[PDB]
């Protein structure tokens, strides 16, 4: 009888997560792009101004499907998120739901940082241990649990 | 002009090609490398090749009517 308890991924400390070297990989998602636009900050230069390090953004196919699905009010968001500076993942699961796609994607790798803004996703991300989220705030970004913010 | 040079050329190509392919029917995958074995298999293919050439002489002497 096969039980399955996932081991704590061995590039993690107690909660320090030494696998997050300063060239970062972030996970952009949908209402974070929308709030970045309606707070009028940029994306790559905004992340650089918040983290003082070179950040590579990533968007998944599930989040791109959500951004296409949300209609023509966010054509600015879609034109911004088809940026050649960002990269793109490729998901393989059923149901384009950004929340469980994101939190599954990060809890089986523990190396991405999650750039989110909605309440349930922030709650699940800060529930699971040792991955940093960032969010919009005022006219800049804000990091929640990176060990070296400065 | 139209002598048996056709039959003689195809006899020559028969001799060298049947010798080579009898050697490659033996020595299956690995070219066997010892002096007396190579020499004795060359004697074996000389024996089989001349056993073919004597059959050529036999059912040509039955044919002859020519040069």
């Amino acid at each position: 009888l096969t039980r399955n308890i996932p081991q704590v991924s061995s590039a993690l400390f107690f909660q320090y997560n030494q696998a997050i070297k300063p060239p970062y990989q972030v996970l952009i998602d949908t209402n974070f792009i929308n709030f970045s636009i309606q707070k009028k900050v940029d994306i790559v230069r905004g992340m650089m101004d918040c983290l003082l390090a070179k950040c590579n953004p990533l968007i998944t196919d599930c989040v791109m499907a959500e951004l296409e699905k949300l209609g023509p009010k966010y054509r600015i968001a879609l034109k911004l998120a088809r940026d050649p500076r960002i990269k793109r993942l490729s998901c393989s699961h059923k149901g384009t739901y950004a929340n469980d796609c994101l939190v599954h994607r990060v809890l089986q790798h523990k190396c991405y940082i999650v750039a989110t803004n909605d309440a349930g996703l922030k709650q699940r991300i800060r529930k699971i241990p040792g991955i940093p989220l960032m969010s919009v705030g005022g006219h800049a970004y804000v990091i929640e649990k990176l060990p070296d913010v400065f | 002009a139209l002598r048996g040079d056709i039959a003689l050329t195809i006899f020559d190509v028969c001799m060298k090609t049947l010798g080579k392919h009898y050697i490659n029917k033996h020595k299956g995958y690995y070219a066997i490398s010892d002096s007396k074995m190579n020499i004795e298999l060359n004697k074996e293919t000389l024996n089989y090749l001349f056993s073919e050439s004597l059959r050529y002489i036999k059912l040509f002497d039955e044919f002859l009517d020519l040069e």
Binding site: - | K25, H26, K27, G28, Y29, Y30, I32, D34, K36, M37, L41
Partner: protein, 153 residues
């Protein structure tokens, strides 16, 4: 042993084989196997050394045949009643297990029955099980003729 004594090397296997050995349907298999084989080649030194090995190992088999025929004839000479009843290759194991012929004759019918499987006998006695019934006589020619528990009786 006879096919290594006949072939020698695998290269000579295409133009010859005996038909007194490997009857009529393993012949083309061993010829195509010697055609497409994956082992290497050996020279005449180790060839004739393993040839002499094949000589000794075919002489062992012919001598074993001659010696078992000798054992049949000699048991028929010494104790012809027992080998007329049971069989020579069972009476020989009986006598040579019990030692002397006299010290096998001085033994009851029950232990002549169970003379072989005594270890299953004694572990079945010292635990609580049921003792066996054939032992060494099971390879005789008649308890194989019987069927069921008729071989026990």
């Amino acid at each position: 042993a006879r096919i290594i004594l006949t072939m020698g090397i695998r290269s000579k296997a295409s133009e010859t084989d005996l038909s007194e050995i490997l009857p009529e349907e393993i012949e083309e298999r061993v010829k195509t196997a010697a055609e497409v084989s994956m082992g290497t080649e050996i020279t005449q030194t180790d060839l004739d050394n393993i040839n002499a090995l094949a000589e000794q190992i075919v002489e062992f088999a012919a001598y074993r045949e001659q010696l078992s025929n000798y054992l049949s004839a000699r048991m028929k000479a010494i104790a012809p009643n027992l080998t007329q009843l049971v069989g020579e290759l069972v009476g020989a194991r009986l006598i040579a297990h019990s030692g002397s012929l006299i010290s096998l004759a001085k033994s009851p019918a029950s232990t002549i029955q169970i003379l072989g499987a005594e270890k299953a006998l004694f572990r079945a006695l010292k635990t609580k099980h049921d003792t066996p019934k054939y032992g060494l006589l099971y390879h005789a020619s008649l308890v194989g003729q019987a069927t069921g528990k008729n071989k026990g009786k």
